[PDB]
Design a protein around this ligand. Structure first.
Ligand SMILES: Cc1ccccc1Oc1cc(-n2c(=O)cc(C(F)(F)c3ccccc3)[nH]c2=O)c(F)cc1C#N
Ligand SMILES: Cc1ccccc1Oc1cc(-n2c(=O)cc(C(F)(F)c3ccccc3)[nH]c2=O)c(F)cc1C#N
Ligand SMILES: *Cc1c(COP(=O)(O)O)cnc(C)c1O
Ligand SMILES: *Cc1c(COP(=O)(O)O)cnc(C)c1O
Ligand SMILES: [Mg+2]
Lengths: 362, 362
């Protein structure tokens, strides 16, 4: 049990630098910056010194457990060029906490969260000109952690690689609301599974349903669970419902963290803002398709949206379920709460207001 | 685009320095690799490249490869056997090709011609045929692997992939019976999931329980499902119970293929042999911990074993469950059925008798 240290960083600058992309013509996760972070681990010697070096292919033994048994996890967070031209991270300590927890569940080696964050800051700082000159674009940060043991054995890995990629990304909407594909045949996560960690294995099994969604003109899967068809996640995003509940109370509701919900940073921020405002009830509670269709019949639904680093908030206009299209009146209700949340989080991200939730770059 | 690769297009780059073969008695499963590997590249733009047999080398993967982030990956496991007549045989290899194709469709990886892949695998084994051990208790493990290599972080069907095959000489095990760790907190697979496919994501999520098993002196996890604790899989192997059932009938029972069971080639072969012998009832049926503990109290259990390519038959002696050790009297009952199955399958594998289940190396 040990850690790499940022003070040990070895920095090999690229001698040929790539042209930055047009900030308006950015496709998510396709353009990479000049440099990457790599840190090697072995059970025999522990963590090697961390390296910032030119973006390169990984050289992996074809037996690597990441390729056979998905011994792997990732994170997603962003750097933002402020209205004051200062680059900020947003709640990055929550990403480090989740990455450490995911590592323990994956049986990958633990590391010092502060040392990783400082290595990430030094990587962003070196490639800081890649943080887009735009109030609607950002630099996506992809910490990734893979088993690299050259053996086919099913066992705790004795070799691993922690790396970080940087990708300039545009606004999710280049509010264009999403249509959701609701097919109960496919289950994202089960009680006693890894659905509450950002482990690669949760996503490979989800691709088929996503291609079926797209084949039916939908952008995301509505992940249903159990005999009562609980609504759990809006594809890669946490699920919020703003409605009049069964007791006639104005309520912001989201599924509870009972093992099948990824605990989103954005979700946490939205719940914290909603509690802070104290203008309506805030409930972590089960929501079923029946609860939703009963509410829609009673004109009790105001807004439905996903939350995530990639979108901030993603309004939902429609659900395809049992061969019918179910309208959700989000965009006919402003969407007032969705807009307020987007405006608040964006104002914090781009330094339009001071917050405990941002760190100015190292 | 080229819709499938063809074996007739094989490009063979032989190794100029060959490695010393291992002692067949000193083999740790899946740690020793032969001189050569098969690699076939795919892109959406051009389709399948020509297949290559070349020296075992590291893979050069874009660090954005979806195999590393979203477990876009699957694998197979089959064996070559050097016969008593010195002819090298494969065992039901077309069942592996069928399962790999099915797993590829569910993974959204590109389809391939099953006959062309098998012919490429035969040509690889033929080149490295001296690696097929000179022993009636050792074999050559064949590890077809299929990974997404798309250099982009988007969640979607991969537009780039690599199909590769590794060869690894393995010994008779990895009868020394196994102790099973039964903890219902962890679930291997769920209805609506991918547990009936050999997708990497099914194994990364299962690793924590296996490391907890080993920490408690157990070699495999007994995978429990549902509120009645159905016994589903003996770790990486299908589960067989030989017992006097509730009706007082001698019975060989295995869980049914209801979506949470990997449809094992060995399982299929054992059911076929058992039906052919007709000496007891053969049942694909649910089995619970309560069924098992009630049977053990009534002295109704004869044998419990796992089945899989890697072991053939793996007798079970003990289950750790709710802080107690439960003895299974497998090794005090011969184990007569386990021995008979092992003897029959190895007689077929090593060419001691003719069978529709083996193919002589092309
Ligand atoms: C040391 C020892 C003593 C006694 C019994 C077993 C032992 O070793 C183990 C081997 C395995 N083990 C693999 O390492 C790989 C495969 C596979 F590659 F064949 C496969 C992978 C994935 C899916 C199917 C098969 N099978 C499999 O059982 C394991 F999971 C756990 C242990 C333990 N402990
Ligand atoms: C961009 C867009 C805007 C509007 C309409 C469609 C869009 O395209 C999609 C993007 C995504 N998509 C990702 O590709 C990757 C992430 C992630 F990298 F942020 C992540 C990964 C894994 C887990 C969490 C987040 N998020 C995410 O939403 C998707 F899943 C589906 C579609 C569709 N159709
Ligand atoms: C990453 C993720 C989220 C959102 O997490 P954020 O930290 O808000 O970006 C939601 N659901 C799933 C399944 C996820 O993987
Ligand atoms: C591969 C596998 C089996 C059995 O496979 P065989 O085809 O008999 O080698 C059983 N259970 C699991 C979980 C597996 O991955
Ligand atoms: Mg053909």
């Amino acid at each position: 049990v040990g850690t790499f240290k940022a003070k040990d960083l070895i920095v090999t600058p690229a001698t040929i630098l790539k042209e930055k992309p047009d900030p308006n013509n950015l496709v998510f996760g396709t353009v990479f910056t000049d440099h990457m972070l790599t840190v090697e681990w072995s059970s025999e010697f522990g963590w090697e010194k961390p390296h910032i070096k030119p973006l390169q292919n990984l050289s992996l033994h074809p037996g690597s457990s990441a390729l056979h048994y998905a011994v792997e996890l990732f994170e997603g967070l962003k750097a933002f060029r402020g209205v004051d031209n200062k680059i900020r991270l947003f709640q990055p300590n929550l990403n480090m906490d989740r990455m450490y927890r995911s590592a323990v569940r994956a049986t990958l080696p633990v590391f010092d969260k502060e040392e990783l964050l400082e290595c990430i800051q030094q990587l962003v700082k070196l490639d800081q000109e890649w943080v887009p000159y735009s109030t609607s674009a950002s630099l996506y940060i992809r910490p990734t952690f893979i088993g690299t043991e050259p053996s086919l054995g099913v066992k705790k890995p004795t070799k691993a690689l922690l790396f970080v990629l940087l990708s300039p990304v545009g606004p999710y909407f280049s509010f264009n609301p999403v249509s959701l594909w609701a097919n109960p045949k496919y289950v994202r996560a089960w009680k006693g599974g890894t659905g509450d960690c950002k482990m690669g294995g949760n996503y490979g099994s989800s691709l088929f349903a996503q291609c079926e969604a797209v084949d039916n003109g939908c952008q995301q899967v509505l992940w249903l669970y159990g005999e009562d068809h609980q609504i759990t996640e809006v594809g890669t995003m946490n699920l919020f419902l703003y409605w009049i509940n069964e007791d006639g109370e104005e309520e912001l509701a989201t599924p509870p963290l009972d093992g099948i919900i990824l605990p989103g940073v954005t979700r946490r921020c939205i719940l914290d803002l909603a509690h802070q405002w104290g203008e309506f009830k805030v409930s972590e509670r089960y929501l079923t398709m029946d609860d939703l269709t009963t509410a829609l019949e009673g004109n009790r639904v105001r807004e439905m949206f996903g939350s995530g680093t990639a979108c901030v908030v993603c309004p939902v206009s429609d659900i395809l379920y049992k061969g019918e299209t179910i309208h959700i009146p989000t965009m006919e209700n402003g969407p007032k709460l969705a807009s307020r949340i987007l405006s608040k989080l964006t104002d914090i991200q781009y330094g339009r207001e001071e917050r405990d939730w941002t760190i100015v770059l190292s």
